[PDB]
Amino acid sequence: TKAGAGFKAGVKDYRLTYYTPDYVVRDTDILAAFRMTPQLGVPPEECGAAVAAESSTGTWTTVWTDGLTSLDRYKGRCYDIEPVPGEDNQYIAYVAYPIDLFEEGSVTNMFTSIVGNVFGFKALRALRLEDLRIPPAYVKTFVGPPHGIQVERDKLNKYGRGLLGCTIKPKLGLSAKNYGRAVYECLRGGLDFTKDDENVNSQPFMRWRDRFLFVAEAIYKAQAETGEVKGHYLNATAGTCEEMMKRAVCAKELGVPIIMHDYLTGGFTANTSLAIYCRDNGLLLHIHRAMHAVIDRQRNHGIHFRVLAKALRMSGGDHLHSGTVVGKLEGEREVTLGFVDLMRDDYVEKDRSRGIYFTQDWCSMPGVMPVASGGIHVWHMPALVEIFGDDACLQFGGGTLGHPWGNAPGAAANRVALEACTQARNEGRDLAREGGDVIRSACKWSPELAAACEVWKEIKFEFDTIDKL
Amino acid sequence: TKAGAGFKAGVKDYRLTYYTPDYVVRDTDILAAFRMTPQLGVPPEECGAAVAAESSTGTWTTVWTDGLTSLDRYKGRCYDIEPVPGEDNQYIAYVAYPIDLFEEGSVTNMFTSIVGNVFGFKALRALRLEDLRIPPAYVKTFVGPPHGIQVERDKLNKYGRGLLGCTIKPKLGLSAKNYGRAVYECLRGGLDFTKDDENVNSQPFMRWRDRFLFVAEAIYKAQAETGEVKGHYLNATAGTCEEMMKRAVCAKELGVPIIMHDYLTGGFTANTSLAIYCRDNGLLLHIHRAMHAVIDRQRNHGIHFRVLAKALRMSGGDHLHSGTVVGKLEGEREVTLGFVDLMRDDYVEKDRSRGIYFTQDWCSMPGVMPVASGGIHVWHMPALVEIFGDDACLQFGGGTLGHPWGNAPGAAANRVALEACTQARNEGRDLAREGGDVIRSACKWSPELAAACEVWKEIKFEFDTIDKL
Amino acid sequence: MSGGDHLHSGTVVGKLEGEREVTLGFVDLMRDDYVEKDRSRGIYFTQDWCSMPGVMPVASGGIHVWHMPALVEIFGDDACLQFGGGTLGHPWGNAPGAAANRVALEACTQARNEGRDLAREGGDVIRSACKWSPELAAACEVWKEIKFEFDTIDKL
Amino acid sequence: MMVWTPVNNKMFETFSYLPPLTDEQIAAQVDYIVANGWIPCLEFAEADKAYVSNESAIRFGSVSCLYYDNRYWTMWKLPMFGCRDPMQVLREIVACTKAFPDAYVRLVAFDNQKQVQIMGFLVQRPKTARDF
Amino acid sequence: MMVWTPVNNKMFETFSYLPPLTDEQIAAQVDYIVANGWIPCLEFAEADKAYVSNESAIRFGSVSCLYYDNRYWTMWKLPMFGCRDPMQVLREIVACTKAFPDAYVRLVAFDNQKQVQIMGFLVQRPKTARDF
């Protein structure tokens, strides 16, 4: 019906009103794929249809007044569903939505409709988002990355090896002259990029404004006295959007190259507005990622890495954070490589072996660059380079700030290992076996790397293969 | 150490550096209580101490450079921990932080430090937040509700019974003149307040701006022709913050009474900035609550209702949505009543029987008002009134837009049932047993309620008592 | 009568005009001020002149080296000649391409400064230049078949 | 140990922190880089034009705004289009080295798939300042 | 072919990409320019003041904003009003050359119809740098 239906009082069966297992997609249709387990006593087509019905129209008693709106091709539809091999009561639901139902590129309306209303239901035990089909006209009314990989390569003025950095710790409370000293020495020693953490940005006495001024004095000389292009990822964090805008505008005055924000740990629309601002002012924008146990690792019951990578890139970012290997974020082969592929590349059709159930049509979607961090250093550089190549943006946390000869020999050792691995890669070496002997060969007179390899002799870890949620 | 420590290379055990089970808390200390299960082979004091160390300082190899910052009283401390009486590997961790570690009232810094960094770890299987101690000086540098429960009571110009409403559905695509007719008729029939959902605000052809003009035309007469104070909660949803600000400012021109936003499903700082704006322009601000299966229901592995009520009120709002009873949100007696107490009230000490592990000092903290929606009508009004009294803000989903005589007799029947229940409540009746006979007695000549009770004669549900996450 | 400081103007071949009875009037009405109407020039009305800013023709310029003499002889030191074959058509790269175009511009301007009969002398001036600019020698081997001047009559 | 600092010389970008590659290592790595489907270009830069600068900030009102100076390299006559021969590259490096005593000569290459240029080995001049 | 780069000297604007015109050719072209109704002026500029500069942008708040510096030439006593003799111009060039060894000397002229000045041949000093 297109409107004018005198419905009899009571809720009509959802399988007779929002279930269509012969549906064939339109070019403007928005589709979503979900992994679900109903509560015991609810049919899976009744559950799928109810999800489609509640995200489209919703009802708690239908009468003739629901006949007032146009239903026809303008409502959500549940397509044919399939079993999950891993568990008997688990099924994969496929739900289609037309373009008529959502505001054009409206992220809180789309988010609230698809995730907000849906991921609640008392008679639903667990529901996990598996994929999304975003049609090209909604992909382009999304704004995507502001200064993505084919822009960032030319903007950074150097490329042909990975980008070397380090995460500044302790998070607590480091005074301006000891921070200035550590940052100057490690950048002048060999690092490309250094990074702040959230507590490092602002403290009860130390203001971000003054931390930025000590960064400005240091950064001018940490290019000028070295010769090579380098910078520092400022981490920018704030309590209100007025503070975010004040933080933006004051650093626009000096127009520093790349900064980062946990703004996208704050909220999606905060990052979307900032990415437009960053695009407008010609900046470079690094995106932080956190909450891995309660977001990324939601087993059968919520968010997953591929949907997270699609959602993050469909807001946008130029760099984006990404496995720590050990500690707080992921390090697994069957998690990271898909996640990175969905960030790096454009024009690729769906494959079930990569967990892709839907293709969003492609051709002119910018790439976005993974930033790993990197708790284990020297011996895990061979495996990291062999697995990831010239992806990353490798920000060490033991490297540099774990070298008992200081920040300059620490940074120099990490730089020597980066160049030695890249030279081994240029030589066509079997890096997984040759890299240990390359590091030993380097250690003869890099003394700095010899000290790095006596200090870190215990770490020999590569990566685990299988997903651990 | 107060700074200047010459630490040897490696990591000194977190139980020898961040664990103090005799710790005497300050009035200015920030405390967090977590329910946890480590991965197999990890001691729970090693896990608790490591969480305290990573959220305070962090390391991936300590040398003399970690001696650069002042550690002493300034670093986080893990207190004595206890087992959970339900599962063998589950423990309750208690972690204290001094005032010096975070920016004053900075919501993304506090969120990223306390939740962002913490809820990551690979060697942690599940971690659930159980409580938070927020010292008064951080509560007051937070902004809280703009125009809370003791302000809204005098501000709205009416009170003495609950506030009667309805949720506008279908979500899809209702044309503006049929929406104008439905809103005029249900407000003129007896409702106090109606509310929009995410799709209702803006659709491909229909702009929010023009939907708002049909609301303005309707609302003027939906007070003027009825004598009684009434209105409509607008919902304002959007894709970018510039669009959100445009949506705010265009309705500032007409200075409309109370509105709501799904802004706090978008992000925390979006609501914080809006609440400041709302305080500035003398408004009232309603907050929506959603994502119940992936936030609220994270059983042993994430967020819970009491911490959610604390987190929501420590951003702030004047109204906040409550429970749907059935469908998308919960309805359970051992879940909702703690959650509502932590929103409504002030000056109450911690109690383990209510799952409260920490007290935040109280005396001048605004209350925030629960909004109940309300999927079942007439027979569940007795139990709802008996449990909640003159809390709510009862926004029906079955009522009004489920009555086959139309919006005016639907609204009139719901209004008659509220006034009949309120008269029964004024008579000091035993609502659980008397309420059915009150409804039967009421039906004699309200014909509208007689039709309501024939139409909804199958729904007899009250509430379940025990949680069902 | 909207305005501009430079304004576009024949490509010689391809997309825009290259004709004598089209360009020369068009250019006069852009360059000059204080001149009364003449029916032989298609002017039917005089807008009063005195303090009306001039505006500068920009040609673009598909054919290079052999058509520089004819272009200079017809237009003088109007233009703003933006080549399309020159520079980005030279197989020795952008610097020798630009250098060949610059050498040809200066050689034509020197011939014009000597009061040469540029339409007939210019070919021998280009040959004389080629002895040691190699860049112009390569330009004249690369563009050896184009000897075109301009057509006269409007071909609309 | 350890006193670290470039004395009488500075770090000329990637591969300067390690010992300088030989002509044989460069030729072998060019053959490898060609084998992996990259397209070489030979480029050069004057002694003060290969070292980062910001003096030009004097002419423009909005600064630093992502702008950089004295990091631009000039290409040596032709890119390696069609032919990829390492001995043609070696003859061009010698001719370039002979042509400019006060300029540095370096090899760069690009990946045509998304058209990204890689700046590789090695910054060299016949008057290169002190080795590390 | 083809190495391209100005060495030990730069291109001093128009007529610097061709070999230097002889004194007789300069006088002959002056006689022609005078015949065509142009009015010559002899002008000179200091070595750092004949080469374009943007440093003075430091003093002003809105920059680059069409502003330029060190492209201004100083006049040699008189313009050629009344008498037009090219041998007087040649005597003045010699007197100018003797007076300022560290300044460049050039001839310019104007067309009085719309009063436009033409900057002609040739930027020359008795210490002039390397020929191309």
From Swiss-Prot, chains A, B:
GO terms for molecular function: magnesium ion binding; monooxygenase activity; ribulose-bisphosphate carboxylase activity. Its EC number is 4.1.1.39. Keywords: Acetylation, Calvin cycle, Carbon dioxide fixation, Chloroplast, Disulfide bond, Hydroxylation, Lyase, Magnesium, Metal-binding, Methylation, Monooxygenase, Oxidoreductase, Photorespiration, Photosynthesis, Plastid. GO terms for biological process: photorespiration; reductive pentose-phosphate cycle. The modification N6-carboxylysine is found at residue 195. Coiled coil: none annotated. CDD domains: RuBisCO_large_I. Its cofactor is Mg(2+). One of its GO terms (cellular component) is chloroplast. Substrate binds at residues 117, 167, 171, 289, 321, 373. It is an enzyme of class 4 (lyase). The active site is at 169 (proton acceptor), 288 (proton acceptor). It is found in: Plastid, Chloroplast. Mg(2+) binds at residues 195, 197-198. The modification 4-hydroxyproline is found at residues 98, 145. Binds 1 Mg(2+) ion per subunit. It comes from the Eukaryota. The keyword Oxidoreductase applies. Belongs to the RuBisCO large chain family. Type I subfamily. PANTHER family: RIBULOSE BISPHOSPHATE CARBOXYLASE, RIBULOSE BISPHOSPHATE CARBOXYLASE LARGE CHAIN. RuBisCO catalyzes two reactions: the carboxylation of D-ribulose 1,5-bisphosphate, the primary event in carbon dioxide fixation, as well as the oxidative fragmentation of the pentose substrate in the photorespiration process. Both reactions occur simultaneously and in competition at the same active site. The basic functional RuBisCO is composed of a large chain homodimer in a 'head-to-tail' conformation. In form I RuBisCO this homodimer is arranged in a barrel-like tetramer with the small subunits forming a tetrameric 'cap' on each end of the 'barrel'. Heterohexadecamer of 8 large chains and 8 small chains; disulfide-linked. The disulfide link is formed within the large subunit homodimers. This is Ribulose bisphosphate carboxylase large chain. It comes from Chlamydomonas reinhardtii. The gene is rbcL.
Curated annotation (Swiss-Prot), chain C:
It comes from the Eukaryota. The record marks 15 as: Transition state stabilizer. The disulfide bond reported in 1IR2 may be the result of oxidation during crystallization. Substrate binds at residues 8, 60. The modification S-methylcysteine is found at residue 50. It is found in: Plastid, Chloroplast. Heterohexadecamer of 8 large chains and 8 small chains; disulfide-linked. The disulfide link is formed within the large subunit homodimers. The basic functional RuBisCO is composed of a large chain homodimer in a 'head-to-tail' conformation. In form I RuBisCO this homodimer is arranged in a barrel-like tetramer with the small subunits forming a tetrameric 'cap' on each end of the 'barrel'. RuBisCO catalyzes two reactions: the carboxylation of D-ribulose 1,5-bisphosphate, the primary event in carbon dioxide fixation, as well as the oxidative fragmentation of the pentose substrate in the photorespiration process. Both reactions occur simultaneously and in competition at the same active site. Belongs to the RuBisCO large chain family. Type I subfamily. This is Ribulose bisphosphate carboxylase large chain. The chain holds residues 320 to 475 of 475 of the full protein.
Swiss-Prot record, chains D, E:
It is found in: Plastid, Chloroplast. One of its GO terms (cellular component) is chloroplast. Coiled coil: none annotated. Keywords: Calvin cycle, Carbon dioxide fixation, Chloroplast, Methylation, Photorespiration, Photosynthesis, Plastid, Transit peptide. The keyword Plastid applies. The keyword Plastid applies. Heterohexadecamer of 8 large and 8 small subunits. This is Ribulose bisphosphate carboxylase small subunit, chloroplastic 1. The gene is RBCS1. The chain holds residues 46 to 177 of 185 of the full protein.
